[PDB]
Design a protein around this nucleic acid. Structure first.
Ligand SMILES: [Br-]
Ligand SMILES: [Br-]
Lengths: 368, 367
RNA sequence: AAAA
């Protein structure tokens, strides 16, 4: 009987190549790559080691493309051929689609960033009936997130204390920020203070944080901060990343939420920390979280991490408590990053619906 | 008959612009989506009297076929070329087929080397023009209004570079800490460390006096004097100048800019770029450091290259000191060319190795 | 997956 053979073009993005094999479940895969995309091709082959093989070809030279594409076609019996032209250069797509459409049992297809499979031959479409696995996608893009947290790694009192930390901080942001930075830099000390009287004290007996914030008018806000993992929450604004992960966890489009991930190199040296990663099923949402932006080139770091770990199909969200300055906003538009400021969108107890609305307007768009 | 060009507008404005410049058509149809409308408007601004914009869904076959067939039918007697370089594979598939139903239609594609590929005839030719840096930046939405040239420096700024490098080599950390103290409080005249190293400005003789101690009881004392030595010793400006200088002599460089700043709409800085090289058919961006301290500087650099120059640029990260394995992996992640001067022949003999590495990469198409 |  006729075999099902998929010829698929490997560009920079491994995701649509992998997704097209997963959808059609082919009997045999021909991965067409260049010298620049050969590692991507090898990572894809490693997910289907028994059926896939690799053909290397120059990405733009027409003389070679036509000659080697005819050679490939000459080597293939009359089977059911499907060509995924999603990846690879326009040059490959132009000639693969034409040469293989000379056979009556050939379908040319394309899978978009929403996991809609478009059959270009029959002018039909259908939807992929599978969800992305985050660990598979990172591996396909060369990496593994071996370190991270779930919202369920945190107790419920870690979640309920979040509005209180936020309120205390708003009594005087600069003093809160300075104390938090001193705590995060020497978290093994027990007492941190400013000259104006602000302080943060750790009480190991009561498993408790006693904090005092001074404002510019000389008033004090003196409160306690007690939760199962409060020592972790106050390190580097982990509580803020937790808050975003918790609320996205309840979002109708989220299938899985991971928090405080670290991507390492082949020698276990850290390459990037990621605040929050949401599995949307047909794409990944990355999230960077800050109290406020100080170094606006953090926006550049963030966008590059997103492209490196998840590829060009991902969405990128940058959340802050504080209003974002115009230079940071323009950089967000430059990089196609969704900016979100909590205090300007309802505050800590009433931002959820605005955030969901902004994401849902973008979730189905195809990234240029 | 008119020469109409229909061109697909993806995220990259350069192939669209370059395709129009090459053929010089009487009429341009910029086919874009709602996601690439800004790109289309910026290309139209360069051809405002001949180009119009048509908005299309990027992937919906039924809409694309209907609206592409209507567009085609709306120009019965015209010679039409179609640039399928930009835009989705969906557009490329149906635009190429629907329009090649006419004998006065050529489908073409321009690659990142500015080679024009005529897909209909299976022929190629090379663009007869060179990149302009300011048009390209404008197309991608920015302006480099601030930058220097190598010629803005003096001859004795160029000859003192190896002396500086060699002084640093005597003890890199001690040199580094004096340089940091200087770069922060430039106006002070004496900087010193507990171990005896010092940097001193002599206002009468208009020179620096520097003394670097090592870890074996010895010291290197020298004079540093050039036209702009005070600027050169700030934030390793001398290193950027050195790379800018050598790239100025490279046969593939058409034009070299250093210390550029891209700013937002209120003149606040978005990125500083150490060195920008016009190669005629693409741009090379350069980042210079004595040594990498925060390896996520590689991420920042790469995104700036994409934002300002596009996906067809080359990116070079040069250091003095060895680039460690974690930094090298990140450069691989980001398709950045790493280059360590010390490991490639030192400050006087690295040119050949550096030109060799760039020349292998220069003709490759970036994925 | 929208000069790959
Ligand atoms: Br804890
Ligand atoms: Br095509």
């Amino acid at each position: 009987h006729m075999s099902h053979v998929q010829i698929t073009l490997v560009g920079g993005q491994a995701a649509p190549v992998y997704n097209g094999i997963t959808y059609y479940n082919p009997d045999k895969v021909i991965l067409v790559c260049s010298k620049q995309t050969q590692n991507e091709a090898m990572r894809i082959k490693a997910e289907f080691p028994d059926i896939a093989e690799i053909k290397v070809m120059d990405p733009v030279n027409i003389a070679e493309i036509v000659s080697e594409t005819r050679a490939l076609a000459d080597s293939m019996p009359d089977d059911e051929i499907y060509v995924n032209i999603s990846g690879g250069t326009k040059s490959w797509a132009f000639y693969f689609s034409r040469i293989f459409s000379e056979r009556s049992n050939t379908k040319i297809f394309y899978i978009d960033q929403n996991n809609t499979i478009w059959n270009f031959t029959d002018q039909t479409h259908s939807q992929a009936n599978f969800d992305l696995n985050l660990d598979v996608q990172f591996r396909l893009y060369g990496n593994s997130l071996k370190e991270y947290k779930l919202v369920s790694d945190f107790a419920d009192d870690d979640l309920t204390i979040i509005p209180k930390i936020y309120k205390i901080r708003s009594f005087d942001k600069r003093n809160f920020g300075k104390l938090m930075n001193l705590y995060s830099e020497n978290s093994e000390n027990v007492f941190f203070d400013l000259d104006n009287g602000s302080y943060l004290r750790w009480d190991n007996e009561q498993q408790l944080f006693e904090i005092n914030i001074r404002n510019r008018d000389g008033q004090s806000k003196h409160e306690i901060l007690k939760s199962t993992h409060i020592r972790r929450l106050l390190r580097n604004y982990t509580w803020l990343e937790l808050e975003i992960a918790r609320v996205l966890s309840g979002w109708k489009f989220a299938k899985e939420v991971r928090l405080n991930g670290i991507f390492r190199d082949k020698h276990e040296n850290a390459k990037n920390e990621i605040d929050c990663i949401v599995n949307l099923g047909n794409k990944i949402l990355f999230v960077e979280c800050k109290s406020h932006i100080t170094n606006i080139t953090d926006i550049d770091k963030f966008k590059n991490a997103v492209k490196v770990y998840g590829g060009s199909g991902c969405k990128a969200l940058f959340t802050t408590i504080d209003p974002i300055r115009n230079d940071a906003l323009e950089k967000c538009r430059d990089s196609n990053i969704i900016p979100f400021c909590i205090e300007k969108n309802g505050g800590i107890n009433n931002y959820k619906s605005n955030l969901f609305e902004i994401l849902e307007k973008e979730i189905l768009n195809i990234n240029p």
